[PDB]
Design an enzyme around this catalytic site. Sequence first.
Site, PDB file in Angstrom:
ATOM      1  N   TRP A 150       0.787  -1.232   0.000  1.00 50.14           N
ATOM      2  CA  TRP A 150       0.000   0.000   0.000  1.00 50.14           C
ATOM      3  C   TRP A 150       0.825   1.292   0.000  1.00 50.14           C
ATOM      4  CZ3 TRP A 150       1.625   2.568   4.176  1.00 50.14           C
ATOM      5  CH2 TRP A 150       2.036   1.840   5.305  1.00 50.14           C
ATOM      6  N   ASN A 151       2.139   1.255   0.255  1.00 51.05           N
ATOM      7  CA  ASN A 151       2.836   2.521   0.481  1.00 51.05           C
ATOM      8  C   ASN A 151       2.931   3.328  -0.802  1.00 51.05           C
ATOM      9  OD1 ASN A 151       4.887   0.876  -0.741  1.00 51.05           O
ATOM     10  ND2 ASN A 151       6.492   2.093   0.269  1.00 51.05           N
ATOM     11  N   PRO A 176      -2.833  -4.154  -2.827  1.00 47.71           N
ATOM     12  CA  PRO A 176      -3.175  -3.915  -1.410  1.00 47.71           C
ATOM     13  C   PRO A 176      -4.674  -3.718  -1.214  1.00 47.71           C
ATOM     14  CG  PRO A 176      -2.288  -1.908  -2.407  1.00 47.71           C
ATOM     15  CD  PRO A 176      -2.165  -2.994  -3.454  1.00 47.71           C
ATOM     16  N   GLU A 177      -5.306  -4.642  -0.475  1.00 45.92           N
ATOM     17  CA  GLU A 177      -6.734  -4.517  -0.175  1.00 45.92           C
ATOM     18  C   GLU A 177      -7.072  -3.217   0.555  1.00 45.92           C
ATOM     19  OE1 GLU A 177      -6.199  -8.702  -1.311  1.00 45.92           O
ATOM     20  OE2 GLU A 177      -5.082  -7.470   0.141  1.00 45.92           O
ATOM     21  N   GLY A 227       6.985  -6.404   0.116  1.00 43.71           N
ATOM     22  CA  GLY A 227       6.303  -6.341   1.399  1.00 43.71           C
ATOM     23  C   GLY A 227       7.274  -6.512   2.544  1.00 43.71           C
ATOM     24  N   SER A 228       6.765  -7.058   3.645  1.00 41.20           N
ATOM     25  CA  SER A 228       7.587  -7.150   4.841  1.00 41.20           C
ATOM     26  C   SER A 228       8.513  -8.365   4.783  1.00 41.20           C
ATOM     27  CB  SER A 228       6.721  -7.235   6.098  1.00 41.20           C
ATOM     28  OG  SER A 228       6.150  -8.521   6.239  1.00 41.20           O
ATOM     29  N   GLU A 249      11.247  -7.642  -2.893  1.00 40.71           N
ATOM     30  CA  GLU A 249      11.643  -6.308  -2.446  1.00 40.71           C
ATOM     31  C   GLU A 249      11.086  -6.168  -1.032  1.00 40.71           C
ATOM     32  OE1 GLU A 249      13.363  -4.858  -6.334  1.00 40.71           O
ATOM     33  OE2 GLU A 249      13.383  -3.966  -4.329  1.00 40.71           O
ATOM     34  N   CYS A 283      10.281   2.181   1.707  1.00 43.15           N
ATOM     35  CA  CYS A 283      11.248   1.106   1.915  1.00 43.15           C
ATOM     36  C   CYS A 283      12.682   1.634   1.970  1.00 43.15           C
ATOM     37  CB  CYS A 283      11.109   0.054   0.811  1.00 43.15           C
ATOM     38  SG  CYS A 283       9.471  -0.668   0.697  1.00 43.15           S
ATOM     39  N   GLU A 380      12.773  -1.751  11.450  1.00 40.08           N
ATOM     40  CA  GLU A 380      12.356  -0.768  10.470  1.00 40.08           C
ATOM     41  C   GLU A 380      11.117  -0.038  10.971  1.00 40.08           C
ATOM     42  OE1 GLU A 380      11.355  -0.727   5.719  1.00 40.08           O
ATOM     43  OE2 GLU A 380      10.438  -2.278   6.987  1.00 40.08           O
ATOM     44  N   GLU A 457      14.389  -4.436  -9.732  1.00 39.27           N
ATOM     45  CA  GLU A 457      13.336  -3.897 -10.573  1.00 39.27           C
ATOM     46  C   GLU A 457      13.853  -2.628 -11.238  1.00 39.27           C
ATOM     47  OE1 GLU A 457       9.372  -5.664  -8.297  1.00 39.27           O
ATOM     48  OE2 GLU A 457      10.020  -3.622  -7.746  1.00 39.27           O
TER      49      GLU A 457
END
Lengths: 476, 477, 478, 478
Positions: A150-151, A176-177, A227-228, A249, A283, A380, A457
Amino acid sequence: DYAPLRLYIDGRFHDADGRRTQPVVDPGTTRVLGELPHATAHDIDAAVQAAHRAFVTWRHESPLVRSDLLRRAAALARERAETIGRHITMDQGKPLREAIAEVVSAAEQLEWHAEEGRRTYGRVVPARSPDVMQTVLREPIGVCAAFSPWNFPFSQAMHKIAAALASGCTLVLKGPEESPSAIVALAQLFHDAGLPPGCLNIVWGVPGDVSKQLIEAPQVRKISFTGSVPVGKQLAALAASLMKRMTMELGGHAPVLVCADADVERAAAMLAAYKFRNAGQVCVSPTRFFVQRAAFDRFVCAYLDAVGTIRVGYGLDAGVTMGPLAHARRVDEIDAFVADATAKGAQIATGGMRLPGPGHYFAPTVVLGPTRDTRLMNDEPFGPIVGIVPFDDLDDALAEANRLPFGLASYAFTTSARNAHRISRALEAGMVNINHFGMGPAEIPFGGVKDSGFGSEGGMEAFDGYLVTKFVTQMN
Amino acid sequence: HDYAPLRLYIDGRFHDADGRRTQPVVDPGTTRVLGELPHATAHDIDAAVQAAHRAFVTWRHESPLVRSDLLRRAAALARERAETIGRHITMDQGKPLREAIAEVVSAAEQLEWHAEEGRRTYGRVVPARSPDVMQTVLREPIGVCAAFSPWNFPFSQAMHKIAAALASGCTLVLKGPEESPSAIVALAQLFHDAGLPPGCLNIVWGVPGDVSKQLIEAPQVRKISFTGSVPVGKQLAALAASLMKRMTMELGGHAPVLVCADADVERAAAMLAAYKFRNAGQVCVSPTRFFVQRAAFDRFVCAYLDAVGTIRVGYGLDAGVTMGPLAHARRVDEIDAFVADATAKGAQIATGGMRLPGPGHYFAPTVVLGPTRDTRLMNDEPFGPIVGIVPFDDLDDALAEANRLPFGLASYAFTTSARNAHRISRALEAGMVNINHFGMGPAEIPFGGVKDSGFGSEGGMEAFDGYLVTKFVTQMN
Amino acid sequence: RHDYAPLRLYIDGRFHDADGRRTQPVVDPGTTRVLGELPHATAHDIDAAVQAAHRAFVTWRHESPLVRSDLLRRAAALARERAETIGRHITMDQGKPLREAIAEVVSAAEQLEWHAEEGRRTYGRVVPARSPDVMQTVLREPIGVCAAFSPWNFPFSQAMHKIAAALASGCTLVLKGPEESPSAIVALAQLFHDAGLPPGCLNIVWGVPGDVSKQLIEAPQVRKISFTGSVPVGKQLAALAASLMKRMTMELGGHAPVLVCADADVERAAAMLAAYKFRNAGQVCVSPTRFFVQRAAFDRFVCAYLDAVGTIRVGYGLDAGVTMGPLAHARRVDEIDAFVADATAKGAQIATGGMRLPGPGHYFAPTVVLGPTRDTRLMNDEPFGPIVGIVPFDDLDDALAEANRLPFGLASYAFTTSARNAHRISRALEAGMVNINHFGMGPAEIPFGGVKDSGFGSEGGMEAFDGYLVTKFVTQMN
Amino acid sequence: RHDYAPLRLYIDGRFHDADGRRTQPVVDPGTTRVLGELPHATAHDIDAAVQAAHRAFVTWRHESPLVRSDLLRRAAALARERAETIGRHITMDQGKPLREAIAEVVSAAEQLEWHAEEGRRTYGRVVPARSPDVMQTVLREPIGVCAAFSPWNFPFSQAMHKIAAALASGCTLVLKGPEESPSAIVALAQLFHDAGLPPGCLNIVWGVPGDVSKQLIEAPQVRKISFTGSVPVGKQLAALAASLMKRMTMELGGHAPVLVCADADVERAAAMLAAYKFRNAGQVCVSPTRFFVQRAAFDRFVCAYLDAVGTIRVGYGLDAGVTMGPLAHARRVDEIDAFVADATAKGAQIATGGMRLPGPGHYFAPTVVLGPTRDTRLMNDEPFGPIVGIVPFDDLDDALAEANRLPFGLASYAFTTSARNAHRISRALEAGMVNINHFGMGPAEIPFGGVKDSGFGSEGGMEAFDGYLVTKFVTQMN
């Protein structure tokens, strides 16, 4: 004022009729924006099968025809940036100007991949015998499954879509929901650009259930996750257990080395504005600041002054340069970082508390002298908080910069050629930024080392996870 | 006496057992015990990982030309010692002496290629959007590596792991094959004699599951490289991925062969018979499923059986022997089961199909005609001296059958048609496609598979991809 | 004679002596004694060398790149074994100190080994096609018979570049090395002979340079030319080659600028630049020549530079402790004299040296000229000798403009601790090579070449075969 | 619309009408009517264009490659928008059918877009150093001001090659296009102007070709030349450029051999080769000219080839249904007549065509010559016109030797179903391009160029920038 949320499977949009939904909430108001339809297990099967069927012909489409189509999608994203960005602001929180910049950045990424898809070069290896021909071909692996967060809901997903499609793969994507409108718009513009049905499918649901089903789907040959770190480790183990390729990532914990010979005020002003973009939910967000002792006070004063010009508020409002955090749990998390830091003797130079009102507002926070056993210097934070510590010996600061299993971005400020060379070589990080922030360009590779993930990427490396090597040797 | 002492090698020192658990090493052609292999303790393995990490700190920064000189010295010694190293390989693995020597020479070429390639781990300068900015994409060695290599080519499989790790600037803890270990000891000896700094290469032995678990879980270990079976590969890959450690894998294959009607059929049959039964078919790229166009089927079979009939099975050191015993008794049981399963499902055993007399694990070259799609032979990797040959009518149907299995390492096709060659090479789902010859030997080409057959490549330009990390450096001046 | 090797032609795998041929004396520049007689190729000899190279090319082009590599590495190993003998003869017929000649051989062995490795990697490209039935490949193939011309300043390693690049790409070669310092070329023929190089692959000829080069360039079988030497001769040969549509690569002179920033380690730079400058008595295409020192560091730099120059010992190249030998021939001494007089006439100070040294040999003192103006020969023409000019600068951009003013553009040098200075200087210099804080043009793995009048193409590195390979685009519909 | 657009010079971002300059008439080859007057640049005009390109290069070279790409892609989009009008004017002043002219504009737009993408990818290299404190980078930087000369056969797309490669590499350009077919170049100037290209980056000049090219090549600020034209003129210009140490790339004539094997789809080959041959009336650098057909396929091939040639419709390029226009100029008609006369005098059969067609314009019949011997002009000189020679062959190696006998080496063609034939032919042919079973030299992403007399360097593909970039080795010790 908020767009309808849909699934997109085999070239068709699908709504809630017959499906479960989940509410979507504005983090700046806490109000409901709309309801997101969940994919059924059958929906997800249909999407994999459609992606597999699409791959059979899409892989053989002319790379220029594919480029033309991807560029047409990028052009539509540019035309629709204000509408797309406004919905992103609503369901994710970031200021409108940042949301629009995200759309533009994603269009450039898509265009770069369109260009790079024409350049998936093979190699001719000189043979030991003149009747032999040796070629190393690069070919699309097949159906891909991608999960994006979502970020940066629009541009993170664009990475998955641009890399899969331009390599000749096809894709089932679970975005992201919690911040979904960006993903619906991507489906819409690829649909409008004429992308053949099945090439791009977007699904939604309980993330662990969706990701498990996609990874175990026999036609899915490659996974891509942003994600995490803990979730990345879980999905990677599952993917690896089935011999499926993966690129990742994950989080970072970026160190900043400000040498005594830097332009100190310049570094502080730049790093303050950059840190609090997307409220630090980045990130690559600079987090651990190591400033040479003789420059520490000058930097801290310059940093706080620049932080003081930030205006926190609702993302659609004029002049707002920082929005709320993405959800209430993020506020609690930063509270815990602040409490842990003060208990261990650190000074809260500014901020450190939530801001009033409904919605997940938090003050930009600067923590001075946090020790090596504070959470801030180990976990983080992914939020509007930094730690700034002095250092005496550059090698000690480098060792501290490398101590954590994170290794995504890193930053350094110096005028010395020797400092720049030693810092850039000694840092254990996928990206080293010296005197500026240079990770924006689509033509450079973005990725991490150690716990921060695998693969890159963007850049020339963009297709590496999506192509298989084929050695063909022929005697005539 | 005729077999060398088996030792561990850690931080530049050899170790005999000195009270450690050992395991017997058996000659597969006589079943006599050759010697005792010492097992590394948990402490030995920790010491090796720590030694590799200390070594990495300086070896990563050593001149690539200095590293090349040293790796080439090691290759020259391997060439000098090929007969002795080869003889011991025949003794503890089974293959004929000529094959063992050829394996050593091939590994020396592979080592030299990597010495040369280590000078060429090029970075990239990306033209910047601003004239004050410098954008470089660097490639840097990842760190300490753990590698596991099998018995079928004990010397050259291990050399792949050592050459790729060392020439990229990494260091290595290696667990070679306990059942055929002399090749690994010789590798340690020649890198030692070439002056490789202590800690750069360490070889350990033990219970394979216990050693590999400890190596993968060692925090200093940052990268894994495994050559072995698909199920073990999946287990180890899952463990490595759970710790966010990079991996490359060379797993099994199930190589299809497409013989088109327009091929030189008799030439194809003779070549495929000699190639298949090298190392008694215990070859990851071994041609296994033969799809022969119907009109060429009988001509191909007769020529294949005639060529198979010239094979001489015997002890690997005996003159004129061109196929040795299988590596272990369990392999004989395995091939027996493939033969029994094929027979039960209606296939014809054209030759072979039984074990051969004598002490040792000797088995006859086996040719199975018309095995159906549900036989083990057409689905599971036999890794032994057996093939199945079936007719086909339509080339696209043969290609789908070639691609049906989750294996995807090597593949072969024989044709004179430019169109057949293009369509076959494009349609095959395989890391390697061989057309009219067997061309996977050269060190300068990449060797690897797709789907269940693993990922990454060994040899060629791609040899270092798993061993280097990308570092993007962008500097505003 | 007794301590100097016999001089021979080498054509189609056979050595030839002077029977039936004209000869030229070879003279020791440190003693003026005649060392031996060099046989000249006849016109028919040269025709035979070209024909032999063509017949050899027919099969050598198709030899395995690993078989070619094995052979080239054997020749390199022989060069290493013979370094002392080859070096001693180089000192005798060229003048440089023994340690320099031996280091030249060792360097040439590394270059040759690099090309052996690189010859396996002349990769082609597969271009993704617009239709799935089409295969598009871009191949690199050897161009054919090459003719090469190499000079006397590094007689062995300059010629090695021509041989290594031609042979390792799959070409064959007729080479005319330096008649004035020829033993190195004979030794190169001998070690390629001893390594088993097939006859015709390498041929060495000698004669009147303009006549030999004219005949070689006009030979129809010759498809590519490679020349290292002076700019004016390169222009003549390049024009002739181009008039016949023949490919050329060229390594010509330079006029290297050195920028010493105020923030440099000034004393370190001065000491390094002094020792490096007077290697081979400055007879070096990349020799540092025009020193631009930031005003605040000028006096400090000059004092340290003069001190370092003062330790140079001039003498005969085989004598112990000699660190600079004589110049290559008498005309070089005259040329440096004219540079000194021209600088003196225009107001410059001769801080050290500036005169010829005694003896019949072509000895000249290491020379440092302070403040030579923009119209001196020293600041415009390549001196190729033991002489430098040092001027202050105030503004770096003006120094950079002066560093770029000449049509030369081979090497250049800079000393600074500033990342900005290093970046600004390296981008702004018009030069094929920029050395910052050290001299790093030695490694075989890097490309060596110039811009503007200093030539085109590169030797060494990945670029080494570019002039020797043709591009062939093959597109096939199946 | 039968209007013809104004012909102008374009220098430093502004257009110039004749304003009293010398002019030259532009003639429609299909009607012989005067279309307009072309203004000639003066010597001062040419100096100003070089100076403007030099000033522009100072900043253009540092512009973001993405900003430069954006601008070039805008230019490409304008070319596509204007394709019908640009194409009609090309037909009028060059002769080719309207459908060919439009396709040329579209093809050039694709070439421009490819170079926009490739300009972002002029990658440098980092070479691993022998010491950890040293950084070795190999940079590629734009060479500077370029001068280019492009011909009339594809007046728009030939010139686009010069413009796209120079601009996208970071260079600037003074371009002299074809005075005989000039509207395409003016259109190019207009669309780059309309796209916002900075003044001086692109300049177009006209005049007496030998005088303009001499002045441009001798201009000091001009550092690199690019020429597409005939072999004899290329050799003349290359020699001048080489005498000044200026870099050059050249696309010269060809003499394309075609090898038709007995195992080919013979009728498919004949039909394809007939339509491809007579595009632009054969006035094509890669035009298939010498057809070697295996004896067993000869009768079938010739019969099928004659049938396909018989479907060609000759007429004015704007008229409906016309598939071949007139030749470009009267001198081309005389030339083809001479080829025909030489062939008949030496015993060949004119199976069809062989005469000029009625009417004022330079119309000529598609001509097929059977069995011309090795001493005919048709089998030795590039005819560049609507004529082919067809001979049988027995042994494939003899056909390859004949395909390679001429000093030409641009394009080549072969038709076979055999993997062995395709391999042996493609490896043995001495040509920059080998086309097997189709014509695949159109894609912007592949390199187009020749060997031997056919030039050097490539246009298009990854290689597109090789002549326009200098190599800079930077080595820094920290």
